[PDB]
C-alpha cells in the first residue's frame, strides 16, 4: 500500500499509547493520594455501624 496508510496508523497508535501512559501516571498518583488521605471511595476500611446502638432508657439515668 501507500506510505500514508502506515503514517496514519503510526499516528493513531502513538496517540493511543501516549493516552495510556498519561492515564497510568494519573492512576498511580490518585491511588497514592487516596491511600494517604482516605477521602475517596477507594481504601475505605469498615467502621462500626451506628444503627446497632440502642437508644432507650437504660435503668440508670447516666447511661
Amino acid at each position: 500500500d501507500g506510505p500514508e496508510k502506515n503514517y496514519e496508523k503510526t499516528m493513531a497508535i502513538l496517540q493511543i499509547e501516549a493516552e495510556k501512559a498519561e492515564l497510568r501516571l494519573k492512576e498511580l498518583e490518585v491511588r497514592r493520594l487516596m491511600r494517604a488521605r482516605g477521602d475517596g471511595p477507594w481504601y475505605q476500611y469498615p467502621t462500626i455501624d451506628k444503627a446497632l446502638i440502642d437508644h432507650s432508657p437504660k435503668t440508670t439515668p447516666d447511661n
Binding site: 493516552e19 492515564l23 477521602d39 475517596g40 471511595p41
Partner: protein, 57 residues
C-alpha cells in the same frame, strides 16, 4: 380517704407536664465530621481497556 393502688398500676408509664425546657444536646457532643463526597454519575467503558502492560482489551 386514700385508695391503695391495685396490681399493675404503680408500674405504668405516665406523662409529665413540666415547664423545664427540653435539653437540646445532653451528651455534650461535638460536631460530626463531614461525610465522604459519595460522587455519582453514569458508568462509561474503561478508557483503552485494562491498560495492563500489553493487553489492548
Amino acid at each position: 380517704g386514700w385508695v391503695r393502688p391495685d396490681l399493675g398500676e404503680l408500674s405504668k408509664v405516665t406523662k409529665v407536664k413540666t415547664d423545664r425546657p427540653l435539653p437540646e444536646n445532653p451528651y455534650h457532643s461535638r460536631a460530626r465530621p463531614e461525610p465522604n463526597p459519595e460522587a455519582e454519575g453514569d458508568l462509561k467503558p474503561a478508557k483503552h481497556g485494562s491498560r495492563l502492560f500489553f493487553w489492548t482489551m
